[PDB]
């Protein structure tokens, strides 16, 4: 397969935040096929940003997602053309996110560009006043429609001093070349900062996905 | 306890769809423990109904609910003063549903009350050409907030042909006294029309409903 067992990938994100412009660098690594990965970024322009690193983690890696072999993997057959992702972040106190991602092979290399559009964040909202804790385990809805993968999740992201700050994904994966349409299902995920410096100039995040038919059917 | 592990229920809705007005009522039963139950609904009023009965089915009963014991089970505890609900229901074509009910208990029998309200169904949608064919299994994401018990549900109708009509619920559960919060956990289900006769004016609805925490964390 021209996906290997262990695989690495770059991250090329820029974007803004209320007006707030930034970039971040990344290298991550993982393993494709145990849905099991980790990422170490650097805000290379824009730093130390002035905003929760949280919106910003979930747009630094889809083909590290265990599928059953029951379960077409989308994403994983569109490469080496690969594909792009589309997804919108709509939080509870009207903030609305627009995410583009671009995901091409190299090698052994993934390489993802992404622009991150965020904005209507209340200035003293958790956010802007960098209140959250990361997000909670999560399970993405996914089905096929007009050659896409369409995916929906119900986020939340764990607030200090208790409580959750809730964020509803839309993410609609695109390949670039026709492959074999998953059946209704979903991706289980949890996502979270590992290690970080005093102003998330430089984070590590670990991720684990993994696919599966509903549990009650 | 006050709940049983055999107990009944009766439903008794009403309420309009794109103007008509229509009276449903339901005769229930299932195991509270075990998350397993059955109810056989005949249309008392306005039938047949011009819509799909899948509008309606998720409308006809939590306390069935399988709980394990390290989660905190709020409607349970609720009882014997009880609970009412509150459900908002988004369809993809622009269609909204606001639902209420409320939740007794008189012996070994629940008595649900439930008024529907649904509108801006398109004419020649799915709903009012009555070409759904089933909720797909899903699962809702619940958290506490200020004493109530908050539920969101990407939830998906199959259609005829092979497509999906999509849905967002958020349902608010609320107590009639305070109870032991849980911690943020999901609900599967597996909601299915079992019998029915030509014109569905008598339904039969068999639903399954385990929580549990999240499956990867
Ligand atoms: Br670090
Ligand atoms: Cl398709
Ligand atoms: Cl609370």
């Not at 994403?75 to 996110?97: H, L």
């Amino acid at each position: 397969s021209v996906i290997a067992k262990q695989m690495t990938y770059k991250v090329y994100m820029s974007g803004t935040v209320n007006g707030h412009y930034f970039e971040v660098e990344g290298d991550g690594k993982g393993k494709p096929y145990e849905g099991e990965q980790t990422v170490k970024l650097t805000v290379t322009k824009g730093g130390p940003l002035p905003f929760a690193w949280d919106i910003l983690s979930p747009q630094c890696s889809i083909p590290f997602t265990k599928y059953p072999e029951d379960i077409p993997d989308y994403v994983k057959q569109s490469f080496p053309e690969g594909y792009t992702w589309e997804r919108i972040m709509n939080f509870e106190d009207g903030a609305v996110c627009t995410v583009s991602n671009d995901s091409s092979i190299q090698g052994n290399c993934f390489i993802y560009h992404v622009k991150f559009s965020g904005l209507n964040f209340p200035p003293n909202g958790p956010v802007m006043q960098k209140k959250t804790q990361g997000w909670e385990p999560n399970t993405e809805r996914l089905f096929a429609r007009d050659g896409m993968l369409l995916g929906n999740n119900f986020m939340a992201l764990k607030l200090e001093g208790g409580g959750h700050y809730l964020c509803e994904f839309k993410t609609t994966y695109k390949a670039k070349k026709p492959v074999k349409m998953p059946g209704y299902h979903y991706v289980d995920r949890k996502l979270d900062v590992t290690n970080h410096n005093k102003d998330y100039t430089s984070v590590e995040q670990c991720e684990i996905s993994i696919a599966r038919k509903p549990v009650v059917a």
